Design a protein around this ligand. Structure first.
Ligand SMILES: [Cl-]
Ligand SMILES: [Cl-]
Ligand SMILES: [Cl-]
Ligand SMILES: [Cl-]
Ligand SMILES: [K+]
Ligand SMILES: [Mg+2]
Ligand SMILES: [Mg+2]
Ligand SMILES: [Mg+2]
Ligand SMILES: [Mg+2]
Ligand SMILES: [Mg+2]
Ligand SMILES: [Mg+2]
Ligand SMILES: [Mg+2]
Ligand SMILES: [Mg+2]
Ligand SMILES: [Mg+2]
Ligand SMILES: [Mg+2]
Ligand SMILES: [Mg+2]
Ligand SMILES: [Mg+2]
Ligand SMILES: [Mg+2]
Ligand SMILES: [Mg+2]
Ligand SMILES: [Mg+2]
Ligand SMILES: [Mg+2]
Ligand SMILES: [Mg+2]
Ligand SMILES: [Mg+2]
Ligand code: NA
Ligand code: NA
Ligand code: NA
Ligand code: NA
Ligand code: NA
Ligand code: NA
Ligand code: NA
Ligand code: NA
Ligand code: NA
Ligand code: NA
Lengths: 194, 92, 56, 237
RNA sequence: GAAACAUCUCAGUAUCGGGAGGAACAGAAAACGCAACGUGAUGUCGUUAGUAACCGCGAGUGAACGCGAUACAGCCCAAAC
RNA sequence: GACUCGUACGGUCACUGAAUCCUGCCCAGUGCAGGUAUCUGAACACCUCGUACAAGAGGACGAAGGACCUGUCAACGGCGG
RNA sequence: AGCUUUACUGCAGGCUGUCGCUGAGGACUCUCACUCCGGGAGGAGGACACCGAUAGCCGGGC
């Protein structure tokens, strides 16, 4: 039979309808008054969190992060530039807001490592994402066969090197075939043309 | 100059002389779906758009003759070289 | 007044001093920042790629 | 070119800033839970460096000592009041509603409780005209008819120092001393006296503006100079 | 550079911000598409090829599948119960 | 964030440059501003055509702006045959 | 190279429509988001404004 989780999931397919709609219209009011990064005791979207690796366990942390909506906040050129490079308004960043969120979170918790993140809505001027972080030093995690992998040294600052899930997707690594000639194994090894 | 609306002449399709009717080529309408149309949309961005930033040329003092010759029997038309003519009016 | 020799006479102000962190006489005692190692501005040591030829 | 003077201003550097650290008080109406029972005595009359007009030191019944925007005719010893029931005399502050129409008011609040915004310069005064349960109309010193919340507090009387503008500065030095007490760069060089690079009116073999002086409202900073969105110019007709 | 120059080119180069390791990254197909009764995770090397593709269709720019090699390795959750 | 511990007797933006006698005529062009029946005026949504969808073509509505009208020269300037 | 402009091409900026935030009953009411004033209670404003996106106009300010 359906899991209880499936209901949380099925409700979030349309955050603008039903009870969830009224829930958001309410939460966001408190959210808009919270800070850039807020640690929260429980995931707002349980199905999604667990689906992404979450676990009600010691060393597993979650924090909601809000980032501004829109294009790049860019400064107009202060020296000679050909028309092509004189833009300001339409320039957008190559890293998506969800990735900016994962990074701001990880910096808030210097000892933790980003495991994954998911969207929890947006109002007219900002987006909120809940990031799941892990304490690579807690034995509760060092002894977990499903998460201890994030304890290895080579997983340090994984979010800053785009090893996150949203990182790899944003790096154009989803497709294993056509279209990923300039993305795999890395953007940089491909001359940064991806 | 003046020009007969109809007259006998060679029909390249029938391969035999027949009465043709002369009409001025009316411009067909563009679809905006040709390859060039997609390149304009694709290649236009921030700053100058290269070729797509250029504007219409000018005019020659007199234009050449742009006509269609329709074979009165088979109904098929053919084109011919044109010649400079300040004005062209048909007779009947 | 000439901007040359005559304006050289008022130069008795101390700015750049021996740096507590790198030992170079680049610690601006008024700004409290080392122009050489970045002490007082950066936890990380001051360093730029333009300090050497691009392919080296 | 180079940024024009109007642009250097915004950066808020020393040259353009006001000598705030030399200012006495941020004149604002007192707050009263209600009742109006608040009253105090004028202890002194000081000079206000920020407004070139007198200000009054006042001690209230609850120990609070604060400078106040003094109207004309207030002297040491006098007792002033602040509240809904305050007496209707010069120097007292009460909401427009409790104020009788046709009475000169000063230091009027835009939003009730904001502390006073309108009519606070030397000798000026607002004019309460219409009352209502909803709107209290006041005629500001500019001549405009301002619709206001009757709950907006205001002081009775005209501001002190009236007529300050009647005497001419006579000499640059006097202007200098006044200018030094304000957030203003002075003296003023005419744009037409500058180089093209420095101002849209600069350049030429003789002094005259390049184009016409009336500039569009939409003009960008760096170009909005001269007669801004003038509806007309000159004195004729 | 295009014998000017704006797209293009120089070049995702120089330079800047953040960060890992002894190597990084990638990686067990919602692949390929010599179309098959076929191949079978990923890097890399040789080639495919200056080919296809781009481009004031100017100057210029420029892959991939496959193949021959190197080395090979395959697994764990979420949910159902 | 400056102006601003400021509020039109303010402060901003310009021109002229103490006093004295004065400062004519011109709103066609250009600028600014106000108005505007009508005309013109983009995109979204909407209607028609087209396409089992889509590209695309047309229509209706019409913002600021423009046409048109007015004000204005101590506004740019003009004051002849 | 600096400077100019009704040189060519663009880029900021201002104005304006539209979409999102955004809700209840071609003109209108409301309050619950949102904004602002108030120490608070509460007041004003209010689906507009702000902000994000886009479209047209102006645009040697660059
Ligand atoms: Cl991390
Ligand atoms: Cl013809
Ligand atoms: Cl003054
Ligand atoms: Cl194969
Ligand atoms: K170039
Ligand atoms: Mg363009
Ligand atoms: Mg010098
Ligand atoms: Mg000063
Ligand atoms: Mg104040
Ligand atoms: Mg002057
Ligand atoms: Mg000069
Ligand atoms: Mg200029
Ligand atoms: Mg002169
Ligand atoms: Mg002059
Ligand atoms: Mg060249
Ligand atoms: Mg590599
Ligand atoms: Mg050429
Ligand atoms: Mg290239
Ligand atoms: Mg391929
Ligand atoms: Mg002079
Ligand atoms: Mg030059
Ligand atoms: Mg506030
Ligand atoms: Mg220029
Ligand atoms: Na961290
Ligand atoms: Na790319
Ligand atoms: Na493209
Ligand atoms: Na000039
Ligand atoms: Na050349
Ligand atoms: Na050249
Ligand atoms: Na090109
Ligand atoms: Na005129
Ligand atoms: Na005029
Ligand atoms: Na020069």
């Amino acid at each position: 039979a359906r899991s209880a989780y499936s209901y949380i999931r099925d409700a979030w397919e349309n955050p603008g309808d039903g009870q969830l709609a009224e829930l958001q219209w309410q939460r966001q009011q408190e959210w808009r008054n919270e800070g850039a990064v807020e640690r929260i005791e429980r995931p707002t979207r349980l199905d999604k969190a667990r689906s992404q690796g979450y676990k009600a366990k010691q060393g597993v942390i979650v924090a909601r992060v809000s980032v501004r909506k829109g294009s790049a906040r860019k400064r107009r050129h202060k020296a000679g530039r050909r028309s092509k490079r004189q833009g300001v308004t339409r320039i957008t960043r190559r890293k998506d807001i969800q990735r900016v969120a994962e990074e701001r979170a990880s910096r808030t918790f210097p000892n933790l490592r980003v495991l994954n993140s998911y969207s929890v809505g947006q109002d007219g001027r900002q987006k909120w994402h809940e990031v799941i972080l892990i304490d690579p030093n807690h034995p509760a995690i060092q002894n977990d066969d499903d998460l201890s992998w994030i304890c290895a040294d080579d997983q340090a600052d994984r979010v800053f090197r785009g090893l996150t899930g949203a990182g790899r997707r944003n790096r154009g690594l989803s497709g294993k075939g056509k279209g990923s000639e300039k993305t795999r194994p890395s953007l940089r090894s491909n001359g940064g043309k991806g | 100059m003046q020009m007969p609306r109809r007259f006998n002449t060679y029909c390249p399709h029938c391969n035999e002389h027949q009465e043709h009717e002369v009409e001025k080529v009316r411009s067909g309408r563009q679809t905006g779906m040709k390859w060039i149309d997609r390149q304009r949309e694709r290649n236009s961005g921030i700053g100058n758009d290269g070729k797509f930033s250029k504007v219409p040329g000018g005019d020659k003092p007199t234009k050449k003759t742009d006509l269609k010759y329709r074979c009165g029997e088979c109904g098929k038309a053919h084109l011919r070289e044109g010649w400079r003519a300040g004005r062209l009016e048909f007779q009947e | 007044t000439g901007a040359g020799t005559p304006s050289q006479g008022k130069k008795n102000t101390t700015t750049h001093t021996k740096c507590r962190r790198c030992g170079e006489k680049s610690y601006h005692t008024k700004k409290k920042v080392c122009s050489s190692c970045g002490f007082g501005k950066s936890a990380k040591r001051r360093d730029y790629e333009w300090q050497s030829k691009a392919g080296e | 070119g180079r940024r024009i003077q109007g642009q250097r201003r915004g950066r808020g550097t020393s040259t353009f800033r006001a000598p705030s650290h030399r200012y006495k008080a941020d004149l604002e109406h007192r707050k009263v839970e209600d009742g109006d029972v608040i009253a105090g005595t004028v202890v002194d009359i000081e000079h206000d460096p920020a407004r070139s007009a007198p200000v009054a030191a006042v001690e209230f019944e609850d120990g609070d000592r604060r400078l106040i925007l003094a109207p004309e005719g207030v002297g040491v010893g006098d007792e002033l009041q602040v509240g809904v029931s305050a007496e209707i005399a010069p120097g007292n502050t009460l909401p427009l509603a409790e104020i009788p129409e046709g009475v000169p008011v000063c230091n009027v609040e835009s939003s009730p409780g904001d502390g006073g915004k309108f009519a606070r310069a030397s000798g000026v005064n607002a004019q309460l005209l219409t009352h209502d349960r909803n709107v209290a109309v006041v005629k500001l010193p500019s001549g405009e008819m301002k619709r206001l919340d009757p709950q907006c507090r205001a002081t009775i009387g005209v501001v002190a120092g009236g007529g300050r503008t009647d005497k001419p500065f006579v000499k640059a030095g006097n202007k200098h001393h006044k200018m030094k007490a304000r957030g203003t760069k002075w003296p003023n060089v005419r744009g037409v006296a500058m180089n093209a690079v420095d101002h849209p009116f600069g350049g030429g073999g003789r002094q005259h503006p390049g184009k016409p002086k009336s500039i569009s409202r939409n003009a960008p900073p760096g170009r909005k100079v001269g007669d801004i969105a003038s509806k007309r110019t000159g004195r004729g007709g």
